[PDB]
């Protein structure tokens, strides 16, 4: 034939760290500690694991097995399972385009924060700048100062009025135009991800070596730093204080489920693509288990990394760590934590390694994110594509860049929240539900266990079978239903989102999976004979 076989991994450890690097990201750092603190404290550890063992791990492993078995992309694998659901492979693609529209921009901020941290005196320490207002009040200033409703901090001023420049927009209505600085930053980022993907899985298994190992080192440094800070015990106390009355609330369970879903990131085809390039007789059980156990542990220690510093910050101020940790977003890192860094010796150092940590937290996760889609398209359109990989990868990166220009505006953060919570999320959960239903109830869970019996040499236990059959689809179903029944009220930087925000978010969300029902209709209108015979050729693999 013209082309026979696909490529593989250079080393077990390379992809073993690649999947982990993708699982570990920003959200592991700041989302889990916050949601863990406000939902029972240490007592949040109990439902967090239950939603993992019964929900997260089975989806993770089930997703990781199909890829290493069929060795196909996110699109071509459905042709070999359920052709009508092939639209899924396309849907995710569109989804990715939305995600990459904001997920990179965040890193851009860090980058802009990193290139501004080479000064002996950090910009967000003093108030004597070109962006600060008359409200700017800092420390190493007059004592007795008292905070006012309109007063702001130099860190908050630096994030708000300089890098983000969100004061130049009135909301989603008026947000233009684009900031060229963050454009250059996001260009540098879209350049650093290009040379880590364009050669294929060869480089994406080598670049990951740094991006996945650096954050643990940096987290260690920040850990031994924050542990030495006075009054850091308050943050740990607030972090681990058991509130068993929270478990009675049906909300924290859904929060844990969603949280453990998104941290794992199953159902997206990334793990499918990563598993595709691997040994056929290679173990899937141990791989999935270990990686996940890390993604979580890493979240767990990240909690300390944050709360020691926030505890110190509450000690320097006056207590109630919730007050210093009211805002649940990037501001917790770009303002609070940064302001805490500025008031420490060797501040330049602890700033550089921190922002560098953030960037490396993001890239690896962004490497795979594109990697899965690229793999899918190349596997769906083989030999019409792959003529060169750099061409297609470039064609994707540039498109994502133009797709991120909406986010690079002055009112970009608003768009970040809107897209991340009202658009991409429920759609990823939705398509994940569709996959979970499709593999278990159409392809057959028994045949799946037989395939695992072929790869691993033994059929998977009843504990996992009973999870794939009933527990996991209901696990996703619960989250989806919980969101759709009551979407959360969005708020960012003293600005409440318009009532029509949900309409826009749902509009962007639905436009992503317009392809699956119309593709079902496509094959249903294309395949001759009875509709039962067409659905028979649609149910039976090809």
């Amino acid at each position: 034939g013209s082309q026979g076989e696909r490529e593989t991994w250079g080393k077990k450890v390379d992809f073993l760290l690649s999947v982990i690097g993708y699982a570990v990201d920003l959200g592991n750092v700041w989302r889990f500690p916050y949601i863990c603190a406000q939902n029972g404290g240490g007592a949040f550890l109990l439902p967090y694991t239950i939603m993992a063992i019964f929900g997260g791990i089975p989806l993770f492993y089930m997703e990781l097995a199909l890829g290493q078995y069929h060795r196909n992309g996110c699109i071509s694998i459905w042709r070999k399972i359920c052709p009508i659901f092939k639209g899924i492979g396309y849907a995710i693609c569109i989804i990715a385009f939305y995600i990459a529209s904001y997920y990179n921009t965040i890193m851009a901020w860090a980058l802009y924060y990193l290139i501004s941290s080479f000064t002996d005196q950090l910009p967000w320490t003093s108030c004597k700048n070109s962006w600060n207002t008359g409200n700017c009040t800092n420390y190493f200033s007059e004592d007795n100062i008292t905070w006012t409703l309109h007063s702001t901090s130099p860190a908050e001023e630096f994030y708000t009025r300089h890098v983000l420049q969100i004061h130049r927009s009135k909301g989603l209505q008026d947000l233009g135009g684009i900031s060229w600085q963050l454009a250059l930053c996001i260009m540098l980022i879209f350049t650093v991800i290009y040379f880590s993907i364009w050669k294929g899985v060869k480089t994406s298994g080598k670049v990951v070596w740094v991006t996945a190992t650096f954050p643990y080192i940096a987290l260690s440094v920040l850990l031994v730093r924050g542990a030495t800070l006075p009054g850091a015990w308050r943050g740990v106390l607030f972090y681990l204080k058991p509130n068993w009355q929270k478990l009675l609330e049906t909300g924290v369970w859904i929060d844990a489920a969603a949280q453990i879903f998104f941290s794992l990131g199953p159902g997206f085809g990334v793990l499918l693509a990563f598993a595709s390039y691997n040994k056929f007789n290679n173990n899937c059980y141990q791989d999935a288990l270990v990686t996940s156990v890390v993604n979580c542990m890493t979240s767990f220690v990240s909690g300390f990394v944050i709360f020691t510093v926030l505890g110190y910050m509450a000690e320097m101020r006056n207590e109630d760590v919730s007050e210093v940790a009211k805002d649940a977003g990037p501001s917790l890192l770009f303002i609070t934590y940064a302001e805490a860094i500025a008031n420490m010796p060797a501040s330049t150092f602890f700033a550089i390694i921190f922002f560098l940590m953030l960037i490396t937290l993001g890239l690896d996760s962004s490497f795979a994110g594109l990697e899965g889609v690229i793999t899918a398209v190349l596997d769906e359109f083989p030999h019409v594509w792959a003529k060169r990989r750099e061409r297609f990868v470039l064609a994707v990166v540039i498109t994502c860049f133009f797709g991120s220009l909406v986010t690079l505006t002055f009112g970009g953060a608003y768009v970040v929240k809107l897209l991340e919570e009202y658009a991409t999320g429920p759609a990823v959960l939705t398509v994940a539900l569709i996959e979970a239903v499709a593999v278990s109830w159409f392809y057959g869970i028994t045949q799946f266990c037989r395939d695992v019996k072929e790869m691993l040499g033994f059929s998977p236990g009843w504990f996992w079978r009973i999870c794939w059959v009933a527990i996991s689809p209901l696990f996703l179903l619960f989250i989806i239903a919980s969101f759709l029944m009551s979407p959360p009220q969005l708020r960012l930087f003293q600005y409440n989102y318009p009532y029509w925000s949900i309409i826009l978010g749902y509009a962007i969300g639905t436009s992503s999976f317009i392809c699956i029902p119309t593709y079902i209709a496509y094959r249903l209108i294309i395949t001759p004979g009875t509709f039962k015979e067409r659905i028979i050729k649609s149910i039976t693999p090809e």
Partner: antibody, heavy 119, light 108 residues
Framework: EVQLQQSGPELVKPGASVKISCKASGYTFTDYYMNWVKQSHGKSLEWIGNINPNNGGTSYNQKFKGKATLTVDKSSTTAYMELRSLTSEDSAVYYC????????????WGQGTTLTVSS | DIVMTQSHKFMSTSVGDRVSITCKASQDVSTAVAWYQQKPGQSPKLLIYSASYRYTGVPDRFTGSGSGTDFTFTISSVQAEDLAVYYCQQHYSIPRTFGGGTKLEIKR
């Protein structure tokens, strides 16, 4: 001359509602949180809740959730507190006091408002 | 929530004597304690804020000390017009709670 002038005494039957005003002067009204403290006869002070005059950003106490409702008017720089479902326990002296965001102390108080809930 | 406990509901002192009121909190507070003075028939008046710091328009005879859970409000020279009920209040956690109150009676 920071002065906080409240309304006069109120005698109301149980089950009814009552609104208390709070005219502020001598400072930038949009700069400070406006609070309401309940003091029973012979008892201690009891913080009901605050309100942000800029947008009406209320923050009530769990013990007063559904008991008190705080409003504000920037046009006349005046705060208001409404109490529904009045009982004998509500018969107490209420104050409205100014407070910054940090440190959260009550620098200036009103003269107080004697509430009597009886038929 | 937080429980600010004043064990001594009443304390006796004389004109010119040194009097000190104690305030016990539930958890560690660091330095977030305010002291208010309420004369019979008047509204409370802020005297001390943040453990030791005095507020503007407060005499030098009123001091404040403490760091943690136990706090102390000290008066050096007691005057006849110093007759009032004194309250301590935490200002860190929501909601803001007050102490029981220590009615300072003057002995003569």
């Amino acid at each position: 001359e920071v002065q906080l002038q409240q309304s006069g005494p109120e005698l109301v039957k149980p089950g009814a509602s009552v609104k208390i005003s709070c005219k502020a002067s001598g400072y930038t009204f949009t700069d400070y949180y406006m609070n309401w403290v309940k003091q029973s006869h012979g008892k201690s002070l009891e913080w009901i809740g605050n309100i942000n005059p800029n947008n009406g950003g209320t923050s009530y106490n769990q013990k007063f959730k559904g008991k008190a409702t705080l409003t504000v008017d920037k046009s006349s720089t005046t705060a208001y507190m409404e109490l529904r479902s009045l009982t004998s326990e509500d018969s107490a002296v209420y104050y409205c006091t100014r407070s910054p965001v940090r440190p959260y102390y009550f620098d200036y108080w009103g003269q107080g408002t004697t509430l009597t809930v009886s038929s | 929530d937080i429980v600010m406990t004043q064990s001594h509901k009443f304390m006796s002192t004389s004109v010119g004597d040194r009097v000190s009121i104690t305030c016990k909190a539930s958890q560690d507070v660091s330095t977030a304690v305010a002291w208010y003075q309420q004369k019979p028939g008047q509204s409370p008046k802020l005297l001390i804020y943040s453990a030791s710091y005095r507020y503007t328009g407060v005499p030098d005879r009123f001091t404040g000390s403490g760091s943690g859970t136990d706090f102390t409000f000290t008066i050096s020279s007691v005057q006849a017009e110093d007759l009032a009920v004194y309250y301590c209040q935490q200002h860190y956690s929501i909601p803001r709670t007050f102490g029981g109150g220590t009615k300072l009676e003057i002995k003569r």
